[PDB]
Amino acid sequence: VPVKHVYRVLQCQEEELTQMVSTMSDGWKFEQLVSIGSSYNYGNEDQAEFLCVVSKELHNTPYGTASEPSEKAKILQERGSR
Amino acid sequence: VPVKHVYRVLQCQEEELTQMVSTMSDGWKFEQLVSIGSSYNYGNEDQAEFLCVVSKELHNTPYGTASEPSEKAKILQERGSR
Amino acid sequence: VPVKHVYRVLQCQEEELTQMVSTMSDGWKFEQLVSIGSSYNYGNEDQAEFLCVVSKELHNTPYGTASEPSEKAKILQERGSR
Amino acid sequence: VPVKHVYRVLQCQEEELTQMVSTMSDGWKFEQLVSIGSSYNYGNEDQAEFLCVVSKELHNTPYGTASEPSEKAKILQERGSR
Amino acid sequence: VPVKHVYRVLQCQEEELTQMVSTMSDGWKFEQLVSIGSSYNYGNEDQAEFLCVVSKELHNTPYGTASEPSEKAKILQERGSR
Amino acid sequence: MASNNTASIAQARKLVEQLKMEANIDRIKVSKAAADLMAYCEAHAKEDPLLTPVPASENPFRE
Amino acid sequence: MASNNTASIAQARKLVEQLKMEANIDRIKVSKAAADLMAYCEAHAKEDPLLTPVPASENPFRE
Amino acid sequence: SELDQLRQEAEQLKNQIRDARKACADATLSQITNNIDPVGRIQMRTRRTLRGHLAKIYAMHWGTDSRLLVSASQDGKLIIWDSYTTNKVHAIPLRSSWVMTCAYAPSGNYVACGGLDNICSIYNLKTREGNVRVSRELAGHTGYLSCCRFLDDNQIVTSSGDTTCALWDIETGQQTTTFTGHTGDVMSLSLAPDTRLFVSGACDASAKLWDVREGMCRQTFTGHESDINAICFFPNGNAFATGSDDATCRLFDLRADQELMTYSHDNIICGITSVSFSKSGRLLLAGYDDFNCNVWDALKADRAGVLAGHDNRVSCLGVTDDGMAVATGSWDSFLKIWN
Amino acid sequence: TLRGHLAKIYAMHWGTDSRLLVSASQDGKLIIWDSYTTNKVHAIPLRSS
Amino acid sequence: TLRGHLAKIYAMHWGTDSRLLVSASQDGKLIIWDSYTTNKVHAIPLRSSWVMTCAYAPSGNYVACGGLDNICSIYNLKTREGNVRVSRELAGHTGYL
Secondary structure, three states: OOOOEEEEEEEEOHHHHHHHHHOOOOOOEEEEEEEOOOOOOOOOOOOOOEEEEEEEEOOOOOOOOOOOOOHHHHHHHHHHOO | OOOEEEEEEEEEOOOHHHHHHHOOOOOOEEEEEEOOOOOOOOOOOOOOOEEEEEEEEEOOHHHOOOOOOOHHHHHHHHHHOO | OOOEEEEEEEEEOHHHHHHHHHOOOOOEEEEEEEEOEOOOOEOOOOOOOEEEEEEEEEOOOOOOOOOOOOHHHHHHHHHHHO | OOOEEEEEEEEEOHHHHHHHHHOOOOOOEEEEEEEOOOOOOOOOOOOOOEEEEEEEEEOHHHHOOOOOOOHHHHHHHHHHHO | OOOEEEEEEEEEOOOOHHHHHHOOOOOEEEEEEEEOOOOOOOOOOOOOOEEEEEEEEEOOOOOOOOOOOOOOHHHHHHHHOO | OOOOHHHHHHHHHHHHHHHHHHHOOOOOOHHHHHHHHHHHHHHOOOOOOOOOOOOOOOOOOOO | OHHHOOOHHHHHHHHHHHHHHHHOOOOOOHHHHHHHHHHHHHHOOOOOOOOOOOOOOOOOOOO | OOHHHHHHHHHHHHHHHHHHHHHHOOOOHHHHOOOOOOOOOOOOOEEEEEOOOOOOEEEEEEOOOOOEEEEEEOOOEEEEEEOOOOEEEEEEEOOOOOEEEEEEOOOOOEEEEEEOOOOEEEEEOOOOOOOOEEEEEEOOOOOOEEEEEEOOOOEEEEEEOOOEOOEEEOOOOEEEEOOEOOOOOEOOOEEOOOOOEEEEEEOOOOEEEEEOOOOOEEEEEOOOOOOEEEEEEOOOOOEEEEEEOOOOEEEEEOOOOEEEEEEOOOOOOOOEEEEEEOOOOOEEEEEEOOOOEEEEEOOOOOEEEEEOOOOOOEEEEEEOOOOOOEEEEEOOOOEEEEO | OOOOOOOOEEEEEEOOOOOEEEEEEOOOEEEEEEOOOOEEEEEEEOOOO | OOOOOOOOEEEEEEOOOOOEEEEEEOOOEEEEEEOOOOEEEEEEEOOOOOEEEEEEOOOOOEEEEEEOOOEEEEEEOOOOOOOOEEEEEEEOOOOOO
């Protein structure tokens, strides 16, 4: 059976870009870097403009993933989804 | 037999990007992010600015891929391309 | 022998992009989407705004290497080369 | 064998871009290359134009990992991380 | 057993893109298109549009360790290294 | 099984020692505890910029 | 043997032995060493680029 | 038991060395003859901004062609800068991050680098295939490499933890001479222009000078009250300047085996991180822990000038093999050439 | 202010050096923040959400 | 000017058609420029960099390359598959071409 993938995106400034790229491990493979543009003034003081999309794989794929939410945690997800 | 990959394009704005990538479906792999501008201006404002392209590797190809069609589906899908 | 790869480029609008990507053929992997403009607009609302590079893998050892080239085939290739 | 991928990000303008990709070091895989519109020297021919994300895989179980402690080294990590 | 890779960048105009991508030599895998602009205007009248990074996989892992550069080849390498 | 009441009697038993052990804990009048809290708070009032303004320097999150 | 603290007499021997050749270092006057450094500085004070700036056609940072 | 006599001889001979130093001590002629016209203000200018790095720069070294400088960054990349064009001749990523040292070969053919990997990797820049390849990964240390220097293209000396400065023969891949005798780990190393004697400073506030032909430690110097940070020989090759985490720099002379001169000033409270003489040896260009570094008059012990650039601390100083310019590797990911 | 998260924060804790925060997000990011410069010292993705 | 190379060009050779000109670069690019329109007919990557030779066959179907690889690679431009291919790789020199 094909392995299932878990994906995350990290937000990067120009200076911390190199650090965060070089300081990942344990299967957190780089997938794609993209440039948002600054969440601040454009053309001056440009900071925090990168997204790094990373991924990893479930090694124990035959064991797989199963869902059984906690009874309290359902209302917590309900409160957290909206 | 070499596997088939089915591809989808799902289109998101700036903020939703993290929510959609993190909650990617179980089997769907991430392929690409591309950025478009906006109708107001390129690379500015919140209308929509990203096209996630994703793929799934169909593993049940050696179980067959042909299906029995119907004429009503044929005319409906002919109209769909119109 | 290590497999060969045949690459193609598909021009895309924003309307046509999802249709064409979801209707990619069997064995054709999606490689990369890039966004362009022509002279006036770049991104949305243009008549040429996406290039989709796709690939196919030639698993079988023979791929039409030679059959016996006729005389006029070379002249046609020369005509199309310029 | 589980494999870890070491990732780095190099920086180059287009003058040395070809030289760096062509002479990319032994065993380092080109992952992706991003272009940044530089506010200094109008984009091109500025040193921060292009970032190349590179990587290599390590057969860790044959080789192993490093966990050797050192007090002064720990002080250096403390200073560097802040 | 790890395998060496060789990376090149092929500069192209927007018009030339499809012909080269379709006519990529055997064994040369496609890696990435990256767009560029000019120093005075991007989106129109661009004399350098795309860089297509391509890669080739060098099959012969046990290539050996025997070589002997010519006496004055070092002079050419030194002169071309500047 | 049902006659064993699913060891719910066991639950009952482990309910008991929880409270009596609570009864065995000595209590200190709320007056003395409030006195300790009042004194410790008054002693520490001068520091902790969270309450009082501090110069621009010596403030790690401004200068 | 660990009873003698693991033959630490050996390492003490080695470190003191290091001190003997520190007693074999022949010591010369500070004055003429200062004079030597002073004279070398004065003899190289006119060709040092970091004392007198050479002109724009000689350094490779303004050409 | 009998261990008492051993330390008794230790302290009595140590007293004998201090007595020999004091008896042979004389007035230092340099600052009495401070009558050399003051250099006034030497306005050194930041002329190149080697901004291709992105992480903090931990080490930089010039080559023997005085054109190419190797610079190491925290993330684990070396950059060979052609300082006359602000273009990277090569950009070598490293398998291991947190590189502390980088060395340029005396021929420009090889480059050494190492760090908390506890391994000194040697990259061969010049090969007919093109790209840079690692030649030998010298292993055998158990501490972190802190400085690296080439005697030649086949011998290297590597200061690191474990209090060892083992000299590696590159082709064999094994260290031949193990320099041991420090009590705190050695974290600096400077090669003489004579390439037979080298000094290594440790975090035990001592700088030991060793001869490369055998394994014994020739001399030991102690004038600092805190861990040494970097050393740099005098151009002549019989003196060296050494800074520490204290705000005082100290110039030692081998011909006298005692501290010859001291540099300090009340404004600086931040430690030294790098030291570098000019061609004539009148300028002490030392790297501080402050955002800006200063140059002393290396004979008269007064503030010669400032390098008022950089946003964060400087970490390494390097002068060319002909003294034409100087580079200030610094944590703001910019190397600045000063001239 | 600290801005390196895109999902809702569910927890945060200070270090014993009172400079480094650990911020936990819905998607599975633990961002180790240096608060004196708003410079995110790490950004650890989590295999769980 | 036939800009489009991005590394140092080390050799060139016109064809016998006075239309196509090969350009070999250090990076490992053979660009077969169409001189009149400044359009590259072919952009052949090469296995080894430091290429310093390139010869056009006097028929326009073959091209040659060589350098520090010590190998003369012969590329076939006219094939029914469209893409350029290595027809042969001549080896036997211990030096550079």
